[PDB]
C-alpha cells in the first residue's frame, strides 16, 4: 500500500544526450507521500540527480525524514551501477535533496561505459522514510 515505509522505483530518461531542462518522474508513494526522481544537466558537464518529496502540496506544516540510495543503473553490469546515499529531513523549504554533480556527464553518456543505451539512462531510488509529521493528524 501507499503507506509502505520504503520502496524502490525507477525512471528512464530518454533522449538523454539532449537533456536541457530539469525532468521529473511520476510519483512513487511512500508513507502516503509522493516521491519523485529529478534529473537535470549541471555545470553537459555533470548529471544532477535529486530525490524530491511532496513538492506540489501547498502545505507548510509537513516534514518527513528519510534515507535513500540514488543510483544510476549500468545496464551491462549492475555491479557497475553507480550510487550515492542521502539522509535528509524533507519539508516545504527543502523538498528535494541530492547531488548536482552526481556523475560526470561525459562518463554517463559514454557508450562504452554501459550506462546509456539508445540515448536512454535509467535512474533508481531506494527510499526508506520515517512516519511524516504535519500531514495526517
Amino acid at each position: 500500500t501507499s503507506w509502505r515505509s520504503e520502496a524502490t522505483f525507477q525512471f528512464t530518461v530518454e533522449r538523454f544526450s539532449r537533456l536541457s531542462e530539469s525532468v521529473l518522474s511520476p510519483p512513487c508513494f511512500v508513507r502516503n507521500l509522493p516521491w519523485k526522481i529529478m534529473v537535470m544537466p549541471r555545470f553537459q558537464k555533470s548529471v544532477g540527480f535529486f530525490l524530491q518529496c511532496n513538492a506540489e502540496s501547498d502545505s507548510t506544516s509537513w516534514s518527513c525524514h528519510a534515507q535513500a540510495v540514488l543510483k544510476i543503473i549500468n545496464y551491462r553490469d549492475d555491479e557497475k551501477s553507480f550510487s550515492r546515499r542521502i539522509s535528509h529531513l524533507f519539508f516545504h523549504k527543502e523538498n528535494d535533496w541530492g547531488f548536482s554533480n552526481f556523475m560526470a556527464w561525459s562518463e554517463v553518456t559514454d557508450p562504452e561505459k554501459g550506462f546509456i543505451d539508445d540515448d536512454k539512462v535509467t535512474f533508481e531510488v531506494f527510499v526508506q522514510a520515517d512516519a511524516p509529521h504535519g500531514v495526517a493528524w
Binding site: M38, F50, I86, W97, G98
Partner: peptide
C-alpha cells in the same frame, strides 16, 4: 556520497 544538497 559527497555533500548532498538541494537542487
Amino acid at each position: 556520497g559527497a555533500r548532498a544538497h538541494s537542487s
